[PDB]
């Protein structure tokens, strides 16, 4: 019985631990999600993977999950492990609301989940979750926020982050084109279509290959809007009109 | 047991020179009704000890079951050891006290007779866990009626023969037939000696009714 | 219930999982702390900023009470659950014995939490070290540290993390009595110490002072720019 | 490749009980001497750094008013056994209204020392000395990671154990006094430690029949050093 | 049963009687109702004699474990708070306990009052028992913060004497302690029949 | 319905001396209006220097005695010496309190010698509070015996009477007389008087007859 | 060898090695010898020490007024069964109010120690109990083993270098059922001088004798009261 | 009794293509008011309300456990809840405390979301649902409210006359009750808008 | 290899070796035979005298389960009396629940399922014992069952377990047990265990016999001394 155990919890003699680094190796492939904010609003741009010609395209989204009444998350990695984490922090926000009668701040929802995710890396003799995921949202203490989780269990606030297959190619270009607090939610939409033009090897940016959802603050609404496939392609060609002018004039 | 349904009545017991004699009737009452008229209220434990009981009869069949197993499993060890009568008296005392402490008693009152290693043994066991030893015992209304007849012989004459004791029990069983509404004219006498345990059959008494012609 | 002995003895008497965890500490970022006679000063280095992230979510100096600060190194996932269990204990002390928690008491809670956790079934040990700094009642400033095996241990100056042997060898040739003369003079010891480490040329350092009556006070990168100017200016003229 | 934690040797002893005996050869050395006048009991500190505060570490710690202790090997898991010994003496005082003797403290700890397994996880890597004065006079005991305790007269425990035990059999006799048993132990510690002996590298504690457990400090300690 | 305690400039004075009854029958005349927790703490016995004897012996166990771990003595505020929490777990089950906790502390004198119901209050004067209301009347007249030592001895001694005179369940002898800086000191123990000849003339 | 208690009577008496301790009790077991036996003492020998008396509900007196005799063996197997008299009294206070919410209906008096060879008497309540006294009387006739020993032993309420300590000889006839007065007016006080005397050399016993109503 | 790691795994020959390795632990402890007459049961032990200033490790323990044992093996497992041993004697005395019979005690030990020899990750108890006591049938000498197989015997010896002690007992056991306590003991003392090197034997500080007797409660003799028994022995022939 | 410890009254009434709900405003303890703005009608999505009456603890407790289970329903599924489905949800919630029951009696009123059809029902304190077509009432002054609605209800009523009927039903029945009053709030919902009015009642 | 460590793994040809290894431990125990007569069952165990120091009557390989049921074992003795405890405990729960003495077709069924339950898991090992059960009833006659370490039970007119198993049951079928009463059987049980275990391997040995039937009034007990001395008088007539 101790001959069949795989010991998914112990250290390695070099100090690190192997089991989550293999999971953070699997988080490299299989998906692309990114977020950006500088002003009123925050967006999630995700790239669809299964683009086969026989699917129904239902459930209002594919990788976007509405968590609270005023925050949502984009996910990446093992999709079966993703569904269990989503409906786990979905009722953390409700048992907060049951206890305090107030919507949950966006930061301490992330810390609650990342303590559950950390415990599997630490005891129990258990496979960890191969899931990293973003967080957008709004609260009255700091406004629009943007977070990133890791399978190790540590989080962080950000302004622009991708966890794609060429995420390191995207982050090196995000910190070449930005402005702190002045990118409104049209330049951010224009910058989002430019970044995933690069990191997607499939060229020409088919409007069904991506998903974009925005979170804008209306007075007592905090409207989370998954924008439809009729206004994506006009935003695609708007990138395509200026790039022919910017190349030829240089 | 909260309420005793089918009950017994008084049980007698007295030592003599080399053995103990115990008698009790063969009736199980139910309130004021005599339903079961052929039950036996004396159990012969293995060879040198012997038990009778009063109180609730369904609880007596339970202890008849448990003590029956504690003797069977010992004798197939081949140890050369058996339980003395006071070892059973010590066991049965702990069984009463550990069960009233859970507020769920056994509605019984038991008399343990025994003859081991040349000497007689006679022990009392109460429902509440009160236990002692005496050269003569009686339960129920026998503590009021037959018990004074036992002590006045034993204080004037400390030791008794076997024939004197068996005569003296049958006089006390006659008294309980007259002055007790829960008695019955059919009893049995059990006796330990060095030879073993012997239980006699359904004996009967001889009553006198000559004062009924006195107006 | 996963019942398996993780930490076992070696054939020469070591605990391998304990000393493997001490190498996870040996590649976390450097944290340095000294104490003055009136104001303590501790400050991490190697902030490693990427200018696209929130600067407050990456902090490693946190407070357990008003009087007790805490810095750490190692892996940050196991750190912030030791902190959240220590915040509960130092709060439940106030429901008991009425005075606030002494700085020595809270390190015995952390080290005993960290030891018995290298003793249980099916648990790898923690991979962090700590610096607990506090000025207790009657105004006695002192500090401690915590080995991952769970040995609490007081100091006058210390440094953990990646590049801790060079900094500790730097402080022994540098910790005089007059180096803790002024409050602005003890800070010039720390900024000279972390500059003698992984580079951190005023852009990767974050000191945090405590003047024995306030809370923690992070100076923004303007006085650190002011201090690193004069720390080099004295080195500019003497040599 | 991997045995359990509960496996006998072909030679028959165990593995990890025998491994824990090797672990106490890395701790600091410690010397205790039983004398009819009282029990003296000393240790070194093994100061690593000049910046280290010296008094924060300790090896002598008391269990009761009349029982002291001394630890070696690992230190972090010694604090578990000390706390079990403190609670055990208070439960004995609570129910019997007297002081638990020095021997019956030790077997209360030694029954705890071998209880690891895979139900209800490793042996303790410490070694202890117990100095105390019960009603049979002054006593001195020494337990093991294996759970074996025996009364000694002059026991030396630590990394310099067998070097000190040879030099301790030649100076001890049954009619010592406490003033010279203290001086006899510091000569042995002066030979075996690395650094030079001063009032900070070591500490002592004695228990007498008259007074309670007393631990020396840096004022009354260095008179024995200068008059060594 | 009558106990009292009051603090003043020179420490705390504790006094009690010694009669323990059983219905109308008197069990004993020599019951020491001020038990000695430590060399630096004192506790009284009021209500259930066995319940005050147990839980304050159990407190003395707990304060000793605190001293070995922390290397200083416990405060008077912390000691009563431990006793208030242990008793609360048996609330409603029928414990009788009305003790008081006395002792010098780092903040000066300490005098707290702990009930079996969960009351934990501070104060300057207290009087607990069946004849406690007889003790309050004479004690409120002669109380001052600036009493002398020999004057405060006479106040607490005569105050018990008036309570045993009216109450039927109070009597025996008058025990008297004094909590000082270093620790408590036993003052005296006078019989009431000797005080009757003293206080008459 | 089923009441778990009954009163079996009994009366015990202990006197602490200068180098002795005398413990006496009657030998009658009886509940209700009847008599169970005329021979059932209460003198229980714990050690050679400690005798306990147990009066009250007899089913609890049988149980409590056997609990104590086990724990005296557990002390010796764990401490290599017998218990002293003061250690027994501190132990039994915890045993009685352990069933605080379903108590024993037992009155207990422990007599015996201390470490210095002096008498010691510890009297208990059914919950487990105690103190050390010179003489106590427990049981049914405790209201009759306690005022008499205040006059004779305590020398109370007397004037111009010298204070001589009680000898062994005076304490024997003082005990024998006070049960004869108690057997007249109490219906529970029995027939034989078992007197156990603890000295520095062992335990002597003596049985004195009474009236047998 | 892969068949030599856990108690569960059988060998291809049918011999579990983890039981056989616990037999090596009882061969490491010092020797002790038990024997009986018609009316007495005597067990004699041989103490060891580490240095000349440390005390000697005692081996003979008092279980009840009519039962005593002698240990060989690691002492922490011995106290784990001894506390079980005391507990099973006094609760039978609590319930039945009688001394528990010796042959019925050991059957509880054999059931107690057989359980960890069949589970997973459970060691056997390495201990070597020799048991001497009284039933109503007179004296009894029993031995146990870590294989949970107890033996009824009339004279045995276990510990390090015990085979030489058994050869002495086989050629003298015709005399044991007659003699009184005086030369019954110094028959057993002549067994312990057989199991020693040829220079030191019995210097009144390494030997302990226990007797349970037909009118005698079980009594342990240590290092001062041994001296009446230990005198009267001849010199070792050489 | 227990229901009369705080008082309360909730009425719902069905109209043509609309449904109105009304309740009182008093919060008090057995004789004594405390405040006159105690909420007893809670929103459960658009065009669907619930009214609670009974013990003032369980009014605030059940309305938070029910909101807890409702948000998890409308996020696990992609739609709003039907009016009939919520009736089965509340009846599950009360019946779990079969022997520890909440002392409240809910009243549910709302429009069906797809085909805009009204719906009213009421439940006892252990969850026996009863759907009607005219009116449901709950609270302490129940018998006064039956004399109003049996004499004033009409089958097909525009939202103007529906408001006038439920106002005169509440202002006269609550005025006859002692422990209910201090103001009446009236919600009247329909498929296009929603209307909340407060009536001028006796503060007596 | 590696297919024979746990009892939870089949071989690549489909058999469990941990059961077969535990069967091999039975052929180091000596010999226990038992045959049933016309009106009873007679057990027989030849018992090795290992050394002179042991006592006559030690460590009996022949148990007593119920008042009428007997057990004779061969294997690892610590596991033998462990099975004897649960079989003794199983017969107690039958009487306490169903009121009467347990029959043998049910008793050997309940024990063998308990033995079978340790050949399924990696957490436990199989038992190292084979044993026999025999009894007599007035409504059922005599019964004789036998249980291997795998958990398989059958009925027998006579069986044998130990080292020389085939060499013992060779001579059992020479007898005619269908008609003999259990008096002539006792001489014939002892004779066939004298021709086995030559004096080369063993120095001396001990006869141990058992006995049940209506001549014993249904109770199980040992033979008297005088009857087994007749069988030991019937010892040295097998040299012709």
Swiss-Prot record, chain C:
Q: Name one GO molecular function term.
A: identical protein binding
Q: Which residues carry the post-translational modification Phosphotyrosine, per the record?
A: 152
Summarize what the UniProt record says about post-translational modification.
Phosphorylation by ABL1 or ABL2 leads to an inhibition of proteasomal activity and cell cycle transition blocks.
Localization terms from the record: Cytoplasm; Nucleus
Main location class = cytoplasm
Task: Give an example GO biological process.
Answer: proteasome-mediated ubiquitin-dependent protein catabolic process
- InterPro entries per UniProt: Ntn_hydrolases_N, Proteasome_alpha, Proteasome_alpha-type, Proteasome_asu_N, Proteasome_sua/b
Identify the keywords attached in UniProt to this record, alphabetized: Acetylation, Cytoplasm, Glycoprotein, Host-virus interaction, Nucleus, Phosphoprotein, Proteasome
Its domain of life reads: Eukaryota
Instruction: Explain the induction of this protein.
Output: Down-regulated by the ribozyme Rz3'X. Up-regulated in colorectal cancer tissues.
What SMART domains does the record tag this protein with?
Answer: Proteasome_A_N
Annotated positions of the N6-acetyllysine modification: 226
- List of glycosylated residues: 129
* This protein's GO CC annotations: cytoplasm; cytosol; extracellular exosome; nucleoplasm; nucleus; proteasome complex; proteasome core complex; proteasome core complex, alpha-subunit complex
Q: Which PANTHER family match?
A: PROTEASOME SUBUNIT ALPHA/BETA
Report the function annotation for this chain: Component of the 20S core proteasome complex involved in the proteolytic degradation of most intracellular proteins. This complex plays numerous essential roles within the cell by associating with different regulatory particles. Associated with two 19S regulatory particles, forms the 26S proteasome and thus participates in the ATP-dependent degradation of ubiquitinated proteins.
Similarity annotation: Belongs to the peptidase T1A family.
- Name of protein: Proteasome subunit alpha type-7
Task: Give the originating organism.
Answer: Homo sapiens
Swiss-Prot record, chain D:
Q: Mind listing the UniProt keywords for this protein, alphabetically? A: Acetylation, Cytoplasm, Glycoprotein, Nucleus, Phosphoprotein, Proteasome
Q: Which SMART domains match?
A: Proteasome_A_N
Q: How does it assemble?
A: The 26S proteasome consists of a 20S proteasome core and two 19S regulatory subunits. The 20S proteasome core is a barrel-shaped complex made of 28 subunits that are arranged in four stacked rings. The two outer rings are each formed by seven alpha subunits, and the two inner rings are formed by seven beta subunits. The proteolytic activity is exerted by three beta-subunits PSMB5, PSMB6 and PSMB7. PSMA5 interacts directly with the PSMG1-PSMG2 heterodimer which promotes 20S proteasome assembly.
What induces or represses expression of this protein, per its UniProt record?
Answer: Up-regulated in colon cancer cell lines. Up-regulated in fetal Down syndrome (DS) brain (at protein level). May be the target of the transcriptional activator NFE2L2.
Q: Which organism is it from?
A: Homo sapiens
Q: Which family does it belong to?
A: Belongs to the peptidase T1A family.
In the record, which positions carry Phosphoserine?
Answer: 9, 49, 56
Q: Which residue positions does Phosphothreonine occur at?
A: 48
Q: Write out the GO cellular component annotations.
A: cytoplasm; cytosol; extracellular exosome; extracellular region; ficolin-1-rich granule lumen; nucleoplasm; nucleus; proteasome complex
**Domain of life of the source:** Eukaryota
Tell me what this protein is called.
Answer: Proteasome subunit alpha type-5
Q: Where in the cell is it found?
A: Cytoplasm; Nucleus
From Swiss-Prot, chain G:
The entry's function note states:
Component of the 20S core proteasome complex involved in the proteolytic degradation of most intracellular proteins. This complex plays numerous essential roles within the cell by associating with different regulatory particles. Associated with two 19S regulatory particles, forms the 26S proteasome and thus participates in the ATP-dependent degradation of ubiquitinated proteins.
| Molecular function GO labels | lipopolysaccharide binding
State the organism named in the record: Homo sapiens (Human)
Q: List the disulfide bonds.
A: none
An example GO CC term for this entry is: nucleus
**This protein's name:** Proteasome subunit alpha type-1
Q: Which InterPro entries does this entry report, sorted A to Z? A: Ntn_hydrolases_N, Proteasome_alpha, Proteasome_alpha-type, Proteasome_alpha1, Proteasome_asu_N, Proteasome_sua/b
Q: Is Glycoprotein set as a keyword in this record? A: yes
From Swiss-Prot, chain I:
What GO biological process, any one, is recorded here? proteasome-mediated ubiquitin-dependent protein catabolic process
Query: Keywords in UniProt for this one?
Result: Acetylation, Cytoplasm, Host-virus interaction, Nucleus, Phosphoprotein, Proteasome
Cellular component aspect of the GO annotation: cytoplasm; cytosol; extracellular exosome; nucleoplasm; nucleus; proteasome complex; proteasome core complex; proteasome core complex, alpha-subunit complex
Question: What conditions trigger expression of this protein?
Answer: Down-regulated by antioxidants BO-653 and probucol. Up-regulated by bacterial lipopolysaccharides (LPS) and TNF.
Give coiled-coil spans as residue ranges. none
Modified residues annotated as N6-acetyllysine in this record:
52, 201, 225
Q: Can you tell which superkingdom this protein's organism belongs to?
A: Eukaryota
Task: Give the molecular function GO annotations.
Answer: ubiquitin protein ligase binding
Tell where it localizes.
Cytoplasm; Nucleus
* Record keyword Transmembrane helix present: no
Which positions carry Phosphoserine?
238
Q: Name one Pfam family in it.
A: Proteasome_A_N
Function of the protein: Component of the 20S core proteasome complex involved in the proteolytic degradation of most intracellular proteins. This complex plays numerous essential roles within the cell by associating with different regulatory particles. Associated with two 19S regulatory particles, forms the 26S proteasome and thus participates in the ATP-dependent degradation of ubiquitinated proteins.
UniProt record similarity statement: Belongs to the peptidase T1A family.
Record-given protein name: Proteasome subunit alpha type-3
Species name: Homo sapiens (Human)
Q: Which gene encodes it?
A: PSMA3
């Amino acid at each position: 019985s101790r001959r069949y155990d795989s010991r998914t919890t112990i250290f390695s003699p070099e100090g690190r631990l192997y089991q989550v680094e293999y999971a953070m190796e699997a988080i490299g492939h299989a998906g692309t999600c990114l977020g950006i904010l500088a002003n009123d609003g925050v967006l999630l741009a995700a790239e669809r993977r299964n683009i086969h010609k026989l699917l129904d395209e239902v459930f209002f989204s594919e990788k976007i999950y509405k968590l609270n009444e005023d925050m949502a998350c984009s996910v990446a990695g093992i999709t079966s492990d993703a569904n269990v984490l989503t409906n786990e922090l979905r009722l953390i926000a409700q048992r907060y609301l049951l206890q305090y009668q107030e919507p949950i701040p966006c930061e301490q929802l992330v810390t609650a989940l990342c303590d559950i995710k950390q415990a599997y890396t630490q005891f129990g003799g258990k496979r960890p979750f191969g899931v990293s995921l973003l967080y957008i949202g709004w609260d009255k203490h700091y406004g629009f926020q943007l977070y990133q989780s890791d399978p190790s269990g540590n989080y962080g606030g950000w302004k622009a982050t991708c966890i794609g297959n060429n995420s390191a190619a995207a982050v090196s270009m995000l910190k070449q084109d930005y402005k702190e607090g002045e990118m409104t939610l049209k330049s951010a939409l224009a910058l989002a279509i430019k970044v995933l033009n690069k990191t997607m090897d499939v060229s020409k940016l088919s409007a069904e290959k991506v998903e974009i959802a925005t979170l804008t603050r209306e007075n007592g609404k905090t409207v989370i809007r998954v924008l439809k496939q009729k206004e994506v392609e006009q935003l695609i060609k708007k990138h395509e009109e200026e790039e022919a002018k910017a190349e030829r004039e240089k | 047991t909260q309420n005793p349904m089918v009950t017994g009545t008084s049980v007698l017991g007295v030592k003599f020179e080399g053995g103990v004699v115990i008698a009790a009737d063969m009736l199980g009452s139910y309130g004021s009704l005599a339903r079961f008229r052929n039950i036996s209220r004396i159990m012969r434990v293995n060879n040198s000890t012997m038990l009778g009981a009063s109180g609730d009869y369904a609880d007596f069949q339970y202890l008849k079951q448990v003590l029956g197993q504690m003797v069977i499993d010992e004798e197939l060890l081949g140890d050369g050891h058996s339980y003395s009568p006071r070892a059973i008296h010590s066991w049965l005392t702990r069984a009463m006290y550990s069960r009233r402490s859970k507020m769920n008693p056994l509605w019984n009152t038991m008399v343990i007779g025994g003859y081991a290693d040349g000497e007689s043994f006679l022990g009392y066991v109460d429902m509440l866990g009160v236990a002692y030893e005496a050269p003569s015992l009686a339960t129920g209304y026998g503590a009021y009626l037959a018990q004074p007849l036992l002590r006045e012989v034993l204080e004037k004459q400390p030791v008794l023969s076997q024939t004197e004791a068996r005569d003296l029990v049958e006089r006390c069983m006659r008294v309980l037939y007259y002055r007790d509404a829960r008695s019955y004219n059919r009893f049995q006498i059990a006796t330990v000696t060095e030879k073993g345990v012997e239980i006699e059959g359904p004996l009967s008494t001889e009553t006198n009714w000559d004062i009924a012609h006195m107006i | 219930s996963y019942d398996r002995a993780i930490t076992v003895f070696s054939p020469d008497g070591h605990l391998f999982q304990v000393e493997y965890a001490q190498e996870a500490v040996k590649k976390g970022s450097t944290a340095v702390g000294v104490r003055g006679r009136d104001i303590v000063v501790l400050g991490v280095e190697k902030k490693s900023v990427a200018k696209l992230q929130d600067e407050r979510t990456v902090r490693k100096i946190c407070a357990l009470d008003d009087n007790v600060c805490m810095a750490f190194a190692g892996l940050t996932a196991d750190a912030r659950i030791v902190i959240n269990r220590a915040r509960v204990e130092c709060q439940s002390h106030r429901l008991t014995v009425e005075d606030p928690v002494t700085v020595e008491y809270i390190t015995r809670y952390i080290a005993s939490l960290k030891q018995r956790y290298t003793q249980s079934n099916g648990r790898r040990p923690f991979g962090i070290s700590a610096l607990i700094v506090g000025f207790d009642f009657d105004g006695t400033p002192r500090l401690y540290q915590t080995d991952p095996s769970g040995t609490y241990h007081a100091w006058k100056a210390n440094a953990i993390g990646r590049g801790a042997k060079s900094v500790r060898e730097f402080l022994e040739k540098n910790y005089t009595d007059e180096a803790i003369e002024t409050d602005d003079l003890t800070i010039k010891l720390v900024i000279k110490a972390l500059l003698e480490v992984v580079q951190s040329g005023g852009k990767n350092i974050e000191l945090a002072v405590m003047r024995r009556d306030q809370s923690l006070k992070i100076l923004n990168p303007e006085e650190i720019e002011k201090y690193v100017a004069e720390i080099e200016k004295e080195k500019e003229e003497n040599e | 490749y991997d045995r359990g934690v509960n496996t006998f040797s072909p030679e028959g002893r165990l593995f990890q009980v025998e491994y824990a005996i090797e672990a106490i050869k890395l701790g600091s050395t410690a010397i205790g001497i039983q004398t009819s006048e009282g029990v003296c009991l000393a240790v070194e500190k093994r100061i690593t750094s000049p910046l280290m505060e010296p008094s924060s570490i300790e090896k002598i710690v008391e269990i009761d008013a009349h029982i002291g202790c001394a630890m070696s090997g690992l230190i972090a898991d010694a604090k578990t056994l000390i706390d079990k010994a403190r609670v055990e003496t208070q439960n004995h005082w609570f129910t019997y209204n007297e002081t638990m003797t020095v021997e019956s403290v030790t077997q209360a700890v030694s029954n705890l020392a071998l209880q690891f397994g895979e139900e209800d996880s490793r042996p303790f890597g410490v070694a202890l000395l117990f100095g105390g004065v019960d009603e049979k006079g002054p006593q001195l005991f020494h337990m093991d990671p294996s759970g074996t305790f025996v009364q000694c007269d002059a026991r030396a425990i630590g990394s310099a154990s067998e070097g000190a035990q040879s030099s301790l059999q030649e100076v001890y006799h049954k009619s010592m006094t406490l003033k010279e048993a203290i001086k006899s132990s510091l000569i042995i510690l002066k030979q075996v430690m690395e650094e030079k002996l001063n009032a900070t590298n070591i500490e002592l504690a004695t228990v007498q029949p008259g007074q309670n457990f007393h631990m020396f400090t840096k004022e009354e300690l260095e008179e024995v050093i200068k008059d060594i | 049963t009558t106990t009292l305690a009051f603090k003043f400039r020179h420490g705390v004075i504790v006094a009690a009687d010694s009669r323990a009854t059983a219905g109308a029958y008197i069990a004993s005349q020599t019951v020491k109702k001020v038990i000695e927790i430590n060399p630096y703490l004192l506790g009284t016995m009021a209500g259930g004699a066995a319940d005050c004897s147990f839980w304050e012996r159990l407190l003395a166990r707990q304060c000793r474990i605190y001293e070995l771990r922390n290397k200083e003595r416990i405060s008077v505020a912390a000691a009563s708070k431990l006793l208030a929490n242990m008793v609360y777990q048996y609330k409603g089950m029928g414990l009788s306990m009305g003790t008081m906790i006395c002792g010098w502390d780092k903040r000066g004198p300490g005098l707290y009052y702990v009930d079996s119901e969960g009351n934990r209050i501070s104060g300057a004067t207290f009087s607990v028992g069946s004849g406690s209301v007889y003790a309050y009347g004479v004690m409120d007249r002669g109380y001052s913060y600036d009493l002398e030592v020999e004057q405060a001895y006479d106040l607490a001694r005569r105050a018990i004497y008036q309570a045993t005179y009216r109450d039927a369940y109070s009597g025996g002898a008058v025990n008297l302690y004094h909590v000082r800086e270093d620790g408590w000191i036993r003052v005296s123990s006078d019989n009431v029949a000797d005080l009757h000849e003293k206080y008459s003339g | 319905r089923f009441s778990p208690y009954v009163f079996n009577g009994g009366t015990i008496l202990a006197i602490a001396g200068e180098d002795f301790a005398i413990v006496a009790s009657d030998t009658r077991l009886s509940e209700g209006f009847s008599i169970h036996t005329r021979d059932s003492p209460k003198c229980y020998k714990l050690t050679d220097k400690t005798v306990i008396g147990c009066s009250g509900f007899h089913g609890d007196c049988l149980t409590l005695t056997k609990i104590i005799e086990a724990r005296l063996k557990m002390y010796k197997h764990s401490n290599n010496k017998a218990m002293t008299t003061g250690a027994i009294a501190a132990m039994l206070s915890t045993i009685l309190y352990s069933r605080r919410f379903f108590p024993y209906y037992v009155y207990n008096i422990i007599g015996g010698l201390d470490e210095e060879g002096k008498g010691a008497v510890y009297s208990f309540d059914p919950v487990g509070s105690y103190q050390r006294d010179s003489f106590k009387a427990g049981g049914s006739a405790s209201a009759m015996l306690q005022p008499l020993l205040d006059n004779q032993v305590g020398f109370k309420n007397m004037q111009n009477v010298e204070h001589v300590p009680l000898s062994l000889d005076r304490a024997m006839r003082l005990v024998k007389d006070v049960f004869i007065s108690a057997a007249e007016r109490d219906v529970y006080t029995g027939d034989a008087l078992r007197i156990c005397i603890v000295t520095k050399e062992g335990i002597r016993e003596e049985t004195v007859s009474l009236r047998k109503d | 060898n892969q068949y030599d790691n856990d108690v569960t795994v059988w060998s291809p020959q049918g011999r579990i090695h983890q039981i056989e390795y616990a037999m090596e632990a009882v061969k490491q402890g010092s020797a002790t010898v038990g024997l009986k007459s018609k009316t007495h049961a005597v067990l004699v032990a041989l103490k060891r020490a580490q240095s000349e200033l440390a005390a000697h490790q005692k081996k003979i323990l008092h279980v009840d007024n009519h039962i005593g044992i002698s240990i060989a093996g690691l002492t922490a497992d011995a106290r784990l069964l001894c506390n079980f041993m005391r507990q099973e004697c006094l609760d039978s005395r609590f319930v039945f109010d009688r001394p528990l019979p010796v042959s019925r005690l050991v059957s509880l030990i054999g059931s107690k120690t057989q359980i960890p020899t069949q589970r997973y990750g459970r060691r056997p108890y390495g201990v070597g109990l020799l048991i001497a006591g009284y039933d109503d049938m007179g004296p009894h000498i029993f031995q146990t083993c870590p294989s949970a197989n107890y033996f009824d015997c009339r004279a045995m010896s276990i510990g390090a270098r015990s085979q030489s002690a058994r050869t002495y007992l086989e050629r003298h056991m015709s005399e044991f059922m007659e003699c009184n306590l005086n030369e019954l003991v110094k028959h057993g003392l002549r067994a312990l001088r057989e199991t020693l090197p040829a220079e030191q034997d019995l210097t009144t500080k390494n030997v302990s004798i226990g007797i349970v007797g037909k009118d005698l409660e079980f009594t342990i003799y240590d290092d001062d009261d041994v001296s009446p028994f230990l005198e009267g022995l001849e010199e070792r022939p050489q | 009794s227990i229901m009369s410890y705080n008082g309360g009254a909730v009425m719902a009434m069905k109209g043509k293509n609309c449904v109105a709900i009304a309740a009182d405003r008093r919060f008090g303890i057995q004789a004594q008011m405390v405040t006159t703005d105690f909420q007893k009608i809670f929103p459960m999505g658009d065009r669907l309300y619930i009214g609670l009456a009974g013990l003032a603890t369980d009014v605030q407790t059940v309305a938070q456990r029910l909101k807890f289970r409702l948000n998890l329903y409308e996020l696990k599924e992609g739609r709003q809840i039907k009016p009939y489905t919520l009736m089965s949800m509340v009846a599950n919630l009360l019946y779990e405390k079969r022997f520890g029951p909440y002392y409240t009696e809910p009243v549910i009123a709302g429009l069906d979301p797809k085909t805009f059809k009204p719906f009213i029902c009421s439940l006892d304190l252990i969850g026996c649902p009863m759907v009607t077509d005219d009116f449901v009432v709950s609270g302490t002054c129940a018998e006064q409210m039956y004399g109003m609605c049996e004499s004033l209800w009409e089958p097909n009523m525009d939202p103007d006359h529906l408001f006038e009927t439920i106002s005169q039903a509440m202002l006269n029945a609550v005025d006859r009750d002692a422990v209910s009053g201090m103001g009446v709030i009236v919600h009247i919902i329909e498929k296009d808008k929603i209307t909340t009015r407060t009536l001028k009642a006796r503060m007596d | 290899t590696g297919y024979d460590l746990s009892a939870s793994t089949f071989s690549p040809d489909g058999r469990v070796f941990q059961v077969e290894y535990a069967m091999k431990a039975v052929e180091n125990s000596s010999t226990a035979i038992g045959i049933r007569c016309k009106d009873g069952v007679v057990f027989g165990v030849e018992k090795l005298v290992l050394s002179k120091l042991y006592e006559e009557g030690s460590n009996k390989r022949l148990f007593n389960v119920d008042r009428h049921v007997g057990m004779a074992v061969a294997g690892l003795l610590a596991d033998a009396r462990s099975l004897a405890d649960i079989a003794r405990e199983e017969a107690s729960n039958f009487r306490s629940n169903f009121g009467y003495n347990i029959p043998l077709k049910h008793l050997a069924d309940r024990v063998a399922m308990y033995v079978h339950a340790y050949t399924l898991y990696s957490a436990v090992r199989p038992f190292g014992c084979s044993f026999m059960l025999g009894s007599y009833s007035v409504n059922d006659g005599a019964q004789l069952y036998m249980i291997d370490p795998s958990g398989v039970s059958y009925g027998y007119w006579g069986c044998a377990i130990g080292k020389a198993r085939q060499a013992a049951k060779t001579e059992i079928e020479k007898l005619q047990m269908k008609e003999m009463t259990c008096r002539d059987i006792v001489k014939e049980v002892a004779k066939i265990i004298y021709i086995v275990h030559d004096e080369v391997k063993d120095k001396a040995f001990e006869l141990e016999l058992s006995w049940v039937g209506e001549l014993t009034n249904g109770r199980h007990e040992i033979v008297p001394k005088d009857i087994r001395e007749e069988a030991e008088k019937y010892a040295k007539e097998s040299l012709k």
